[PDB]
C-alpha cells in the first residue's frame, strides 16, 4: 500500500516560487523538508529543507537528490539508497554534515 505517490514527504511537481514559499514560513519549524519531482533536473527528485539562524532569519537549502541509472538514489558521493524513502531515513536521523536533521515534513 505504501506508494511513493502518496508519501508523507511527497507533494509532487510544484513550482520553485511556491517551494521557497512553503519552507520560508514563520510558522514552519527549523528542520521542515519536502521531496518533490526534479523541476530543473531529469528523471530525479529534489529534497529541500528549512533552516533558521540567530542573525538574519530562516533560509531554504535545496538538496537535489541524484538517481543511479541502475536503480538507486544519493545526494552525495558516499552514501547510496534503494529508495527515496531510505535516503530520507538516513538524513532524517543523521545530518551527516547537512543543514539540519529532518524533523518535520511540508504540510
Amino acid at each position: 500500500m505504501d506508494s511513493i505517490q502518496a508519501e508523507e514527504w511527497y507533494f509532487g511537481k510544484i513550482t520553485r516560487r511556491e517551494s521557497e514559499r512553503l519552507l520560508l514560513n514563520a510558522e514552519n519549524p527549523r528542520g521542515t523538508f519536502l521531496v518533490r519531482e526534479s523541476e530543473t533536473t531529469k528523471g530525479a527528485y529534489c529534497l529541500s529543507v528549512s533552516d533558521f539562524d540567530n542573525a538574519k532569519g530562516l533560509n531554504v537549502k535545496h538538496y537535489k537528490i541524484r538517481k543511479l541509472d541502475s536503480g538507486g538514489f544519493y545526494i552525495t558521493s558516499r552514501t547510496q539508497f534503494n529508495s527515496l524513502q531510505q535516503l530520507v531515513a538516513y538524513y532524517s536521523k543523521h545530518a551527516d554534515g547537512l543543514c539540519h536533521r529532518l524533523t518535520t515534513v511540508c504540510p
Binding site: 529534489c46 537549502k61 535545496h62 554534515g97 547537512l98
Partner: peptide
C-alpha cells in the same frame, strides 16, 4: 543546490 560534506 548544496553538497553533503
Amino acid at each position: 543546490y548544496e553538497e553533503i560534506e
